[PDB]
Design a protein around this ligand. Structure first.
Ligand SMILES: *[C@@H]1O[C@H](CO[C@@H]2O[C@@H](C)[C@@H](O)[C@@H](O)[C@@H]2O)[C@@H](O[C@@H]2O[C@H](CO)[C@@H](O[C@@H]3O[C@H](CO)[C@@H](O)[C@H](O)[C@@H]3O)[C@H](O)[C@H]2NC(C)=O)[C@H](O)[C@H]1NC(C)=O
Ligand SMILES: C[C@H](N[C@@H](CCc1ccccc1)C(=O)O)C(=O)N1Cc2ccccc2C[C@H]1C(=O)O
Ligand SMILES: *[C@@H]1O[C@H](CO)[C@@H](O[C@@H]2O[C@H](CO)[C@@H](O)[C@H](O)[C@H]2NC(C)=O)[C@H](O)[C@H]1NC(C)=O
Ligand SMILES: *[C@@H]1O[C@H](CO[C@@H]2O[C@@H](C)[C@@H](O)[C@@H](O)[C@@H]2O)[C@@H](O)[C@H](O)[C@H]1NC(C)=O
Ligand SMILES: [Cl-]
Ligand code: NA
Ligand SMILES: [Zn+2]
Length: 604
């Protein structure tokens, strides 16, 4: 560790702790910068040499964390929790958590190499028949093919290609992860991840929210399944069974907006999927980012800096390069560089993704002057919800009209149902998946799910929550969890479930603040500078204050609450119920064992 990056001496008291944190800050920014830069060089240009550089950057970060972590303990262990400066308690709190820096060097190198290889396997996997990548090829097939066999080929090929090779590495990762966080005093890595919400009743709180949301999901499910039956027939759709996992428009069945064309109740109202118009009008990636930016400046939030437009990767490279395509927003921790890396396609759902990612950037811009340790969301759910909140306004027919993507506007009950259904396919359908992923991982971390039940426990949860089944037989050679990015990339998931609740709480608060008086799902906060100021206050706080308090100041409540989401969707909730009753549907999938047959001519 460079002389310049090592900790010196400070008095063992609060005034010295302030001096400590300031000195940490100065060297931390240099260490984070080099680490994020090496990650960037790799992820926008995957090569062995880039990987080796990234691995060395990670080791350097571990060394830093160890020196400053050990020093924070040495000087402040008896007294940090009693400090008068609450920001300073949070900073010391973060600095003394060593994580992977608790590993001896040899396990460090093994841990870093495992992360690097899991990521390289996920992002370079291909399905060959001439090889299809996940982005754009397999995404497009899953989104717009309607051929059972083609969808099955893409689904099965992806799951096999990414998942199977990941399993030995993921087992070794899990062991070392646990070994690391056990030395910081947690039972397993999952306990550590859960501690970020600082809520003794976290798991119970989540389960109480899910119980209120599940009826909506059950009703959406029944309706969609019925629509699928009418297209695919009773051989491949069981009206009392789970839905085959390849038919819902997405590789993970995680959101269903791409099958909107199959379920839309009133098809001679305005077409609410504007992808065509976007293509017809010749939208490019850059237009999508500029349109998102302009929403943000309409609120008197910050524009993207020059360094964002010069630095970002906003399209998949056409040169020789292999890249990580999964969309991400990057803070280089130097108060100056911020970038998005996305293999942007010209679709409506990607317009939302652009907003999601710009939400991350906007947070980075607003809190960049805080101490590095506080440069994060009030909780991880907050960071994931910013961009989605704006995208709720953008997707309203009224707003789409204003930006030239919808000629006709209508304000009638049929158009509303169409709109709310489209939104339920995006939002309601995700809830079970958003909940289940970390249940899987918590079980793996705690040892409840050993390697010998990875796929068994995955599909138990996928069926339990989502009501889907694999369209071909799976066994424990398969590692279907590892065919989802966040798993080999070691990115927590529960944040997305929290996000999907939070974003409706935020939407209701910002619509109220903007003076809007109509139904929640028709609110557009565009150009509301009052809404901007309320949102800006959250962003600027970073993690400096308890998330419960930040939320209370924003929405008038100190807890996650499903009531705003329920109110948003009220009309379609009522309507789907009535439709399912009228059609004689069974809610749920009591034939839980059912799986579809293979096609006759398959794979050939
Ligand atoms: C789409 O249409 C709805 C419904 O509009 C109502 O019924 C229609 C058939 C017409 O007769 C309309 O004239 C009628 O308002 C619109 O929602 C309605 O918005 C208004 C305000 O924009 C709401 O009124 C407010 O009520 C509060 C008290 O509760 C007062 O303090 C305010 O001064 C204001 O009068 C009204 O509650 C609301 N009604 C419903 C059904 O919720 C909706 O705004 C419109 N959509 C768009 C995007 O224009
Ligand atoms: C596109 C996005 N990408 C992550 C990237 C997270 C990441 C963290 C650390 C290193 C690399 C990447 C994000 O920015 O958070 C995403 O992964 N989802 C958002 C999203 C948006 C709408 C609906 C659901 C979700 C969940 C999630 C997903 O698509 O699975
Ligand atoms: C992708 O990364 C490689 C390194 O892994 C880059 O190649 C280096 O480029 C510099 C400047 O042209 C050369 O001096 C080095 O000798 C190259 N190293 C190797 C081992 O090839 C490459 O330029 C990167 N590609 C892009 C488009 O950024
Ligand atoms: C796991 O499965 C592999 C591939 O085939 C799968 O199982 C057979 C029986 C078919 O039903 C097929 O549709 C499935 O996808 C096998 O090659 C493998 O040996 C199986 N068992 C083990 C222990 O890996
Ligand atoms: Cl999280
Ligand atoms: Na999609
Ligand atoms: Zn995100």
């Amino acid at each position: 560790l460079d002389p310049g990056l090592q900790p010196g001496q400070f008095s063992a008291d609060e005034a010295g702790a302030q001096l400590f944190a300031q000195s940490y800050q100065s060297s931390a920014e240099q260490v984070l910068f080099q680490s994020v830069a090496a990650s960037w060089a790799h992820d926008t240009n995957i090569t062995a040499e880039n990987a080796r550089r990234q691995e060395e950057a990670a080791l350097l970060s571990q060394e830093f964390a160890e020196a400053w972590g050990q020093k924070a303990k040495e000087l402040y262990e008896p007294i940090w929790q009693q400090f008068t400066d609450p920001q300073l308690r949070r900073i010391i709190g973060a600095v003394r958590t060593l994580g992977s820096a608790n590993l001896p060097l040899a396990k460090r190198q093994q841990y870093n190499a495992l992360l690097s290889q899991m990521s390289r396997i996920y992002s370079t996997a291909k399905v060959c028949l001439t090889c299809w990548s996940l982005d754009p090829d397999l995404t497009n097939i899953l989104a717009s093919s309607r051929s059972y066999a083609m969808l099955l080929f893409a689904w099965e090929g992806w799951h096999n290609a990414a998942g199977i090779p990941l399993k030995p590495l993921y087992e070794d990762f899990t062991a070392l992860s646990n070994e690391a966080y056990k030395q910081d005093g947690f039972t397993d890595t999952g306990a550590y991840w859960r501690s970020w919400y600082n809520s003794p009743t976290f798991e119970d709180d989540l389960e109480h929210l899910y119980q209120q949301l599940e009826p909506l999901y059950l009703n959406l499910h029944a309706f969609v399944r019925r629509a699928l039956h009418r297209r695919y027939g009773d051989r491949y759709i069981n009206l009392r069974g789970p839905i085959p996992a390849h038919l819902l428009g997405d590789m993970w069945a995680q959101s269903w907006e791409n099958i909107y064309d199959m379920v839309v109740p009133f098809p001679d109202k305005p077409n609410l999927d504007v992808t065509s118009t976007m293509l017809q009008q010749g939208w490019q990636a850059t237009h999508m980012f500029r349109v998102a930016e302009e929403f943000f400046t309409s609120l008197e939030l910050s524009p993207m800096p020059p360094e964002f437009w010069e630095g970002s990767m906003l399209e998949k490279p056409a040169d020789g390069r292999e890249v990580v395509c999964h969309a991400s927003a990057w803070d280089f921790y130097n108060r100056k560089d911020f970038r998005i890396k996305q293999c942007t396609r010209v679709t409506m759902d990607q317009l939302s993704t652009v907003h999601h990612e710009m939400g991350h950037i906007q947070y980075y811009l607003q809190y960049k002057d805080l101490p590095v340790s506080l440069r994060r969301g009030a909780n991880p759910g907050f960071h994931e919800a910013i961009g989605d909140v704006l995208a709720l306004s953008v997707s309203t027919p009224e707003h789409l009209h204003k930006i030239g993507l919808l000629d006709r506007v209508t304000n009638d009950t049929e158009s509303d149902i169409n709109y709310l259904l489209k939104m339920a396919l995006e939002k309601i359908a995700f809830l079970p998946f958003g909940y289940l992923v970390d249940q899987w991982r918590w079980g793996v971390f705690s040892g409840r799910t050993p390697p010998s039940r990875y796929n068994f426990d995955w599909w138990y949860l996928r069926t339990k929550y989502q009501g889907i089944c694999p369209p071909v037989t799976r066994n424990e050679t398969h590692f279907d969890a590892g065919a989802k990015f966040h798993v080999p990339n070691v990115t927590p998931y529960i944040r997305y479930f929290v996000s999907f609740v939070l974003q409706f709480q935020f939407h209701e608060a910002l619509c109220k603040e903007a003076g809007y008086e109509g139904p929640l799902h028709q609110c557009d906060i565009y150009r509301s500078t009052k809404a901007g100021a309320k949102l800006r206050k959250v962003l600027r706080a970073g993690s400096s204050r308890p998330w419960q308090e930040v939320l209370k100041d924003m929405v008038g409540l100190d807890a996650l609450d499903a009531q705003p989401l329920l109110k948003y969707f009220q009309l379609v909730t009522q309507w789907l119920q009535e439709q399912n009753q009228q059609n004689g549907e069974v809610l749920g999938w009591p034939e839980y064992q059912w799986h579809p047959p293979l096609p006759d001519n398959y794979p050939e």
